Write a protein that binds this DNA or RNA. Structure first.
Ligand SMILES: Nc1ncnc2c1ncn2[C@H]1C[C@H](O)[C@@H](COP(=O)(O)OP(=O)(O)OP(=O)(O)O)O1
Ligand SMILES: [Ca+2]
Ligand SMILES: [Ca+2]
Ligand SMILES: [Ca+2]
Length: 341
DNA sequence: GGGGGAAGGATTC
DNA sequence: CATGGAATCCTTCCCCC
């Protein structure tokens, strides 16, 4: 069982440099401007030139400018990044039939066939990196190991523009030395929760009573970490199918007014429907981000597909139910369509 | 005593 | 001051063998 994981370096920013090579070498910051005021919004991502000064994904654009006022600030162009990503995902398909497109810039390849050991694997990794750089001029990081989790962890250790193999002898020691927070799927909340239980390394999950563990992080997460520490994790690489499509936008001012929110809601619906492109949803959810950043949603499942007209009608009703409950002002609003026919 | 949906929410990348 | 898209996994009904 040999897994090769490919992760594109500072993707959005790298794409912008590809589209304008003169940016190469300068700090580049891809932003999502919300139009609330001059420079309101957040950083989608940034290149390493900017990253070394503390400018990274998630920080307010405003804070990024205080740190690097002379960096290059570019608005996010999602559409473009997706097409570039697709072309790269297609190249990857030429190296294995078993492929899992995990996100817009990640992919796992099951190369248990194409190769018979970590040597051929490491070389197949360079063949792949070299090929992507050559055809799309995009540097990526490769991680190779016994499974998806460790192949991804391996990539995390080598980025940017790297390649690393985590062999069967190195996995065993990581299960003992690796900070459990660096484990994929363990975010700040799960991490700052395993500590209260006394779990700082994967190995620690083996000396605690399952039932206690389950009650703290849930059954799935439980069995997940246990199977990894017990070196038994082995999820198959499989192509995921889009199960939902949607869009959430930011309003200029926080509001509780229906007619003030509608415009944003309808715009989210129009964009979502465009993206559906022939797919017909039976379920619709209206999502609202309140002023204190809490996420509230209301949805309905119909016994048939939802026409754009029905979506408009149903969304307002759902938006009203949200306002009837939480009396908090709404900051962001949008919709999500799922349960395709 | 449990299957199978459906909802509202939680957490991650 | 802090955007945005989508998957998985909870917890709680709910209807009803
Ligand atoms: N907080 C975010 N907001 C909006 N878009 C994001 C955010 N984080 C990541 N993305 C999008 C754009 C990133 O270029 C893309 C890939 O992220 P990754 O997590 O792949 O970061 P990079 O941006 O790839 O950094 P790196 O080289 O460390 O992997 O996903
Ligand atoms: Ca990634
Ligand atoms: Ca990446
Ligand atoms: Ca983490």
């Amino acid at each position: 069982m040999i897994v090769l994981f490919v992760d594109f370096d500072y993707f959005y920013a790298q794409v912008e440099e590809v589209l304008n090579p003169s940016l190469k070498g300068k700090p580049v910051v891809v932003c999502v401007f919300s139009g609330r005021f001059e420079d309101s919004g957040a950083v989608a991502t940034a290149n390493y030139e900017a990253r070394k000064f503390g400018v990274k994904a998630g920080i307010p654009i405003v804070e990024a400018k205080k740190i690097l006022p002379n960096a290059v600030y570019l608005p996010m162009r999602k559409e473009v990044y997706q097409q570039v990503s697709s072309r790269i995902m297609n190249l990857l398909r030429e190296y294995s039939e078993k492929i899992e497109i995990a996100s817009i810039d990640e992919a796992y390849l099951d190369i248990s066939d194409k190769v018979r050991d970590y040597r051929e694997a490491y070389n197949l990794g360079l063949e792949i990196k070299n090929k992507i750089l050559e055809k799309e001029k995009i540097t990526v990081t490769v991680g190779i190991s016994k499974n998806k989790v460790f192949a991804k962890i391996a990539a995390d250790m080598a980025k940017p523009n790297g390649i690393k193999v985590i062999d069967d002898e190195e996995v065993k020691r990581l299960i003992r030395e690796l900070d459990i927070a660096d484990v994929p799927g363990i975010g700040n909340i799960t991490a700052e929760k395993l500590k209260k239980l006394g779990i700082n390394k994967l190995v620690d999950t083996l000396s605690i009573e399952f039932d206690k563990l389950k009650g703290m992080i849930g059954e799935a997460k439980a069995k997940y970490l246990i199977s990894l520490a017990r070196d038994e994790y082995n999820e198959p690489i499989r192509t995921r199918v889009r199960k939902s499509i949607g869009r959430i936008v930011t309003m200029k001012r926080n509001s509780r007014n229906l007619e003030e929110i509608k415009p944003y809601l309808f715009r989210a619906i129009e964009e979502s429907y465009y993206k559906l492109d022939k797919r017909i949803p039976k379920a619709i959810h209206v999502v609202a981000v309140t002023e204190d950043l809490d996420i509230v949603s209301r949805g309905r499942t119909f016994p048939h597909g939802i026409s754009k007209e029905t979506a408009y009608s149903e969304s307002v009703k759902l938006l009203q139910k949200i306002l009837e409950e939480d009396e908090r002002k709404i900051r962001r609003i949008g919709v999500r369509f799922s349960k395709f026919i």
